[PDB]
Swiss-Prot record:
UniProt record similarity statement: Belongs to the FOG (Friend of GATA) family.
ZnF endpoints (CCHC FOG-type): 3-36
Tissue specificity remark: First expressed in stage 5 at high levels in the primordium of the amnioserosa. Also expressed in germ band extending embryos in cells of the developing anterior and posterior midgut and in hemocyte precursors present in the cephalic mesoderm. In embryonic stage 8, it is expressed in blood cell precursors. By stage 10, it is expressed in hemocyte precursors that have spread throughout the lateral and ventral head mesoderm. By stage 11, it is expressed in the dorsal ectoderm and in precursor cells of the hemocytes and fat body.
Amino-acid positions noted as binding Zn(2+) 5 in the UniProt annotation, renumbered to this chain: 11, 14, 27, 32
Record-given protein name: Zinc finger protein ush
Domain comment (free text): The CCHC FOG-type zinc fingers 1, 4 and 5 directly bind to GATA-type zinc fingers. The Tyr residue adjacent to the last Cys of the CCHC FOG-type zinc finger is essential for the interaction with GATA-type zinc fingers.
Cellular localization per UniProt: Nucleus
Function per UniProt: Transcription regulator that modulates expression mediated by transcription factors of the GATA family such as pnr and srp. Represses transcription of proneural achaete-scute complex (AS-C), which is usually activated by pnr. Involved in cardiogenesis, blood, and eye development. During hematopoiesis, it is required to restrict the number of crystal cells, probably via its interaction with the isoform SrpNC of srp. Negatively regulates expression of sr.
Residues of the full protein shown: 1113 to 1146 of 1191
Subunit structure: Interacts with pnr, although weak this interaction is essential. Interacts with the isoform SrpNC of srp. Interacts with CtBP corepressor.
Organism: Drosophila melanogaster
Gene name of the encoded protein: ush
């Protein structure tokens, strides 16, 4: 699922897509990280 080199700009958990790696990062840091 991770810790290697999987996925790119799409969330399998939220079934969402991103046209920019920056967005996929912002989603993981914002959506899956609301208290870093
Ligand atoms: Zn997600």
């Amino acid at each position: 699922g991770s810790a290697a080199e999987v996925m790119k700009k799409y969330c399998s958990t939220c079934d969402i897509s991103f046209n920019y790696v920056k967005t996929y990062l912002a989603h993981k840091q914002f959506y899956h990280k609301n208290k870093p």
